[PDB]
Amino acid sequence: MVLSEGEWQLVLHVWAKVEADVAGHGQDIYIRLFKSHPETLEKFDRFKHLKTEAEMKASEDLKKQGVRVLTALGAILKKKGHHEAELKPLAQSHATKHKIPIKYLEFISEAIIHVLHSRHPGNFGADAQGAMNKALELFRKDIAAKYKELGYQG
């Protein structure tokens, strides 16, 4: 699949707003992910002990992790589809070390869309959401392909 320049513009326009507060968006996304799909928390040995949203918001380590995640995703989105190099290390670690199924990548994609919709309604109308969904679907499609090459069914 391929996004048009117009669709990429919608994606990068709202992403520019996210970048005004990377740490805050990361926390919101994780909290949404862990509350909606608790099973995903079990994959994080360093955070699986967190019991409440309050503890999650107070975790300095979780905040730092969120920044790393959004920074990596932002770098990929900014490549506008030409992300082969960026995807390699990410696919290898998540398939071989962390063992993250594609289903969980779908769950975090849902959390990202939920948070953007909540925080940036003016820059996340129907067309913008459609573009972001398309960008995330492309990301998941390419990661899934790499997973297969690496020997992980995902």
Instruction: Kindly identify the residues of this chain, within the stretch 104-143, that bind ligand HEM according to CB under 6 A.
Output: 104-105, 108
Classify 151 in phi/psi space as left (phi over 0), alpha (psi -120 to 50) or beta: left
CB-wise, 14 or 105, nearer to ligand HEM?
Answer: 105
Instruction: Kindly identify the residues of this chain, within the stretch 60-99, that bind ligand HEM according to CB under 6 A.
Output: 65, 68-69, 72-73, 90, 93-94, 98
User: Are 110 and 65 within 8 A, CB to CB?
Assistant: no
> With CB under 6 A, what is the number of residues at the site for ligand HEM?
17
CB-wise, 47 or 57, nearer to ligand HEM?
Answer: 47
Q: Minimum distance from CB of 43 to ligand HEM (Å)?
A: 4
| Distance in angstroms (rounded) separating the CA atoms of residues 25 and 21 | 6
Report phi then psi at 50, rounded to 5. -60, 130
| Distance in angstroms (rounded) separating the CA atoms of residues 55 and 51 | 7
Instruction: Kindly identify the residues of this chain, within the stretch 23-62, that bind ligand HEM according to CB under 6 A.
Output: 40, 43-44, 46
| Distance in angstroms (rounded) separating the CA atoms of residues 43 and 135 | 25
* Residues near ligand HEM, by CB under 6 A: 40, 43-44, 46, 65, 68-69, 72-73, 90, 93-94, 98, 100, 104-105, 108
